Each structure stands twice: as structure tokens, then as C-alpha cells.
Amino acid sequence: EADKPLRKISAAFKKLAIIVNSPNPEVPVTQFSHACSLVSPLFGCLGIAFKFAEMNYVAKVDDLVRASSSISTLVVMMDKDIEADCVRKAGSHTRNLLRVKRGLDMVKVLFEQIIASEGDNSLKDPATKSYAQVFAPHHGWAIRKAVSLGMYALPTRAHLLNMLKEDEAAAKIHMQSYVNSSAPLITYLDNLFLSKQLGIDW
Ligand SMILES: CCCCCCCCCCCCC/C=C/[C@@H](O)[C@H](COP(=O)(O)O)NC(=O)CCCCCCCCCCC
Ligand SMILES: CCCCCCCCCCCCC/C=C/[C@@H](O)[C@H](COP(=O)(O)O)NC(=O)CCCCCCCCCCC
Numbered sequence: 001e002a003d004k005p006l007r008k009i010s011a012a013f014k015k016l017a018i019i020v021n022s023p024n025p026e027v028p029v030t031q032f033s034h035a036c037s038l039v040s041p042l043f044g045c046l047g048i049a050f051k052f053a054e055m056n057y058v059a060k061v062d063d064l065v066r067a068s069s070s071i072s073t074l075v076v077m078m079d080k081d082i083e084a085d086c087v088r089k090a091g092s093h094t095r096n097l098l099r100v101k102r103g104l105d106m107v108k109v110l111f112e113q114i115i116a117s118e119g120d121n122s123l124k125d126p127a128t129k130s131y132a133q134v135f136a137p138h139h140g141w142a143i144r145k146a147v148s149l150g151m152y153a154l155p156t157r158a159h160l161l162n163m164l165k166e167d168e169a170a171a172k173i174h175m176q177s178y179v180n181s182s183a184p185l186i187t188y189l190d191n192l193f194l195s196k197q198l199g200i201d202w
Contacts, residue, residue: 004165005041010177012038017181020188027188029068029077036061036100039107045163049153052146057103060096067093078192088202098200101189106134108182111175114157118168121156138201 002008012035019025040061043054071077074097081087081094088095113126128151136144155163161171193200 004174005038006164006166006171006174006178009035009038010174010181013178013181013185016185020184025188027074029064029071029074032074033061033064033068036064036104039103042107042164045160046155047150047153049150053150057100060100060103063091063093063096064100074189075192078196078198082196082198087198094198097189098193098202101186101200102134102138104182104189105186106130108179108186109133111179115172115175115179117157118172121158123154123157123160124151127151127154 016027016032016035019027019031037058040054040058043050043057046054067077071080071093077097078087078094081092086092086094109130110126113130114123117123117126128148131147135147139147161168164171166174190200
């Protein structure tokens with residue numbers, strides 16, 4: 001109890017889904033960055049092959065955590081970056097947010113594909129399909145090929161759930177929860193970008 005990462009995730013993101021759906025939504029950077037850090041333990045359930053993905057995501061979340069001590073909300077964070085004209089500058093808060101947002105969407109589609117792929121001990125199909133939908137349009141060739149290689153170093157479905165410390169029943173519940181919770185959040189984040197004419201495809 002409390003060594004169950006899927007449950008720390010579902011709880012944290014259900015709070016954010018309430019904030020985002022309520023009127024006049026103000027998403028705190030502390031609260032947002034914390035929930036994003038709760039995804040990081042999902043790496044280290046994967047092989048050593050995905051340590052390049054783990055470092056990149058964690059580094060970006062660390063930045064958002066570091067930003068959370070000076071910046072009030074996510075909106076304020078983006079506004080400050082527009083005003084400093086560094087939105088697309090490498091390592092900026094807003095740019096990291098966009099990549100992190102894709103990371104959340106990646107987890108979402110993966111959970112969706114995993115739940116569907118029940119009766120198959122291979123994570124090859126869910127992982128491949130989900131990466132193709134979320135990250136393939138944004139990653140260069142070398143990154144995409146390195147990823148397809150790392151797909152062979154993936155654990156089995158049973159072993160993933162074992163390391164996540166859940167049986168099939170509980171896992172499918174807390175995964176479906178995140179999928180439900182993250183959807184309005186991803187939409188909210190997408191809209192922050194679109195409503196400010198920043199785009200989301202860069
Ligand atoms: C269980 C199935 C796992 C499928 C494989 C997971 C897919 C993650 C592959 C991402 C490779 C990260 C290397 C790419 C780095 C950069 O090119 C970009 C842009 O960075 P910038 O130049 O702006 O500094 N980084 C990203 O797009 C961040 C993506 C990391 C988020 C990964 C989420 C993994 C989802 C959960 C996996 C436990
Ligand atoms: C070390 C790996 C050895 C395998 C080499 C054989 C693989 C066949 C490569 C087929 C050609 C790849 C198609 C080219 C895609 C281009 O769009 C990209 C540039 O766009 P972006 O990456 O941003 O999507 N091509 C590249 O970035 C380089 C293509 C790699 C070609 C083989 C690399 C081997 C280099 C050997 C150097 C001594």
C-alpha cells in the first residue's frame with residue numbers, strides 16, 4: 001500500500017480534471033508538476049533501453065518543478081515566456097510543457113491500447129501504436145528508429161503489471177481512470193497553446 005504508482009497517478013490526475021472542468025480554471029504549477037513527476041516511475045518498469053526517454057521526461061518535469069516556486073499558474077508561466085519572447089527557445093518552461101503534454105498523451109493512449117490488448121502478453125502492439133499516434137509526428141528519424149529498437153527490450157504485459165504491483169483487474173481500473181482524467185487536461189493544455197496563437201506542432 002502506497003508502493004502502487006498507478007494509484008498515486010490516478011488520484012493526482014483526478015484532482016486536476018476537477019480543476020480543469022470547473023469554471024475559471026487555475027492550474028497551479030506546483031500541483032501540475034507534481035502529478036507529472038508521478039508518471040516518471042513508469043520508466044524503470046521498461047528496460048534500460050528507454051533510459052534516454054526517462055532522462056528527457058524527468059529533466060523537463062524538473063524544470064516545471066523548479067518553475068513552480070516563482071510562477072503562480074500554468075497560464076502565468078506561458079504569458080511570461082511570450083513576454084520574454086522565448087516560447088520556442090530550447091529548455092524554456094512553455095516548450096517543456098508542450099513536450100510534457102505529449103508525454104501525458106503518450107501515457108493516455110498507451111493505457112487505452114493496453115486495456116484493449118488484454119489476452120496478449122506482448123506490449124509490442126500497444127507501445128508501437130501509441131508512440132506512432134503521439135510522438136512519431138514530432139520525433140526525427142533517428143529518434144524514431146532508436147525507439148523502434150527499444151521496443152524489443154520491452155517487458156511482457158504480465159511483468160509490467162507485476163512491477164506496477166497490480167493484478168489485471170486493479171490495473172485496468174486505475175489506467176482507465178487516468179485515461180478519463182487526463183483527456184480534459186490534455187484538451188485544456190492544448191487550448192492554452194491554441195488560444196494564444198502558439199501552436200502545438202512545434
Ligand atoms: C511502455 C511503452 C513505451 C514506449 C516508448 C516510450 C516513448 C518515449 C520516447 C521519447 C524519446 C525521448 C527523446 C526525445 C527528445 C527530444 O527530441 C524531444 C524534444 O526535446 P527538446 O528538444 O524540446 O528538449 N523530447 C520529447 O519529445 C519528450 C518526450 C519524453 C516523454 C516520454 C513519455 C513516455 C510515456 C510513459 C513511458 C513510461
Ligand atoms: C548505425 C545504424 C546503421 C544502419 C544504417 C542503414 C539504415 C538505412 C537508412 C535508410 C535511410 C533513412 C531515411 C532518411 C530519412 C531522413 O528524413 C532523415 C532526415 O530527416 P529527420 O531525421 O529529421 O526525420 N535522415 C537522417 O537524419 C539520417 C538517415 C540515416 C541513414 C543511415 C545512417 C547511417 C550513417 C552511417 C555514418 C557512417
